[PDB]
Amino acid sequence: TFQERLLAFERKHVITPEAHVTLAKQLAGDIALELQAYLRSKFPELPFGALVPGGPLYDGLQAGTAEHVRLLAPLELEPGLWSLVPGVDTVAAEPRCWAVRRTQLEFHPRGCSPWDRFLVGGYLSSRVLLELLRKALSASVNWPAIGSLLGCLIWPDVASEELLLKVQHECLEFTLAVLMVVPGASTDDRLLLAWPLEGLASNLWLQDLYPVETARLRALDDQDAGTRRRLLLLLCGICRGHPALVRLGWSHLTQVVLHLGEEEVAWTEEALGERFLQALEFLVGSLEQASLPCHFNPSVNLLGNFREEEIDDIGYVLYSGLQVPESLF
């Protein structure tokens, strides 16, 4: 029966050995302090906060390093000198993005803020910020020495802004995503990231709902000892398992679990198999209508940039939910 195979798959392909989790946090934590030391040394005029490692590796166990490890570099913006403009209200009419508008230019002209050098027109440009950090990471940070000090190899990847970590021999590999971030809301912990999409509006920042989403999932599970977050890790592991399903990533499947999870329905381990099948069901339904909106930002459709064949292809792989469920493990 289904429950046994599900637990078995979780045991074999989802759960991460605690030595590897402990080790990964150690390297990522240590890389952050070295990288922070560099940034403070080389750019003391740029008021970044302390680098914060995070992501699924840190937020509950035992996710491990299946996903990227977030390395947050917070910009400290002068209060009231900067204003948020939602991307859907800019000329790029992009709900996934946000603009950061320089304010009070009459009495505080360009140059009053250290961030002004990253201005393109009247907005703080994530793209220009990205260029600066990419250059520092790739040509200005002493990665051979840091690697030597920590007994591993660290090097910048050829796309976006990723730090690849080898190994450390002891059965581990992972990726650090260096994320320059601004606060994006006063009432919760959502962020704006300086992240590429280097077509369209690269001056715009990318909305990051990850902190809000994981707080919600943690909040929900803590009140009924639920398995929502456990289910999200399952869904991720399976989709990584299939070359067709690989585009369905953490953020996509989060939406699925928030939808089901936002109900007073059984979230015990006993019902995990049913919650799982219900998720596949929801996914297949979302696919045929090509709509999977963000729970905390419904105007963004996480399936929007999928081509028709992609969706159709994912659909036929996901067929198995009630009919032949362990065919997919």
Q: How many whole angstroms separate alpha carbon 40 and alpha carbon 48? A: 8
At residue 199, φ and ψ (nearest 5 deg) are: -90, 170
**Which residues make beta-bridge pairs with 100?**
84
Tokens of 163: 């730090």
Strand, helix or coil at 161? coil
Q: In this structure, what are the phi and psi dihedrals at residue 189, rounded to the nearest 5 degrees?
A: -100, 20
**Distance of alpha carbon 215 from alpha carbon 218, whole angstroms:** 5
Method: X-ray
Computed from CA positions of residues 122, 126, 128, 133, in that sequence, does the dihedral angle turn out positive or negative?
A: positive
Helix or strand or coil: residue 294?
strand
Question: At what resolution in Å was this solved?
Answer: 2.4
Cα 190–chain centre separation? 11
H or E element in which residue 128 lies: helix 126-139
Residues forming a β-bridge with 179: 72
Handedness of CA 51, 56, 61, 64 (dihedral sign): negative
Residue 123 bridge partners (DSSP)? 101, 120
Domains and CATH numbers, the chain: 1-15+209-329 (1.10.1410.40), 16-208 (3.30.460.90)
CA-nearest of 56, 58, 77 to 67 is 56
Task: Tell me which residue of 292, 287, 289, 272 sits closest to 317, measured CA to CA.
Answer: 287
- Discontinuities after residues in the chain (C–N over 2.5 A): none
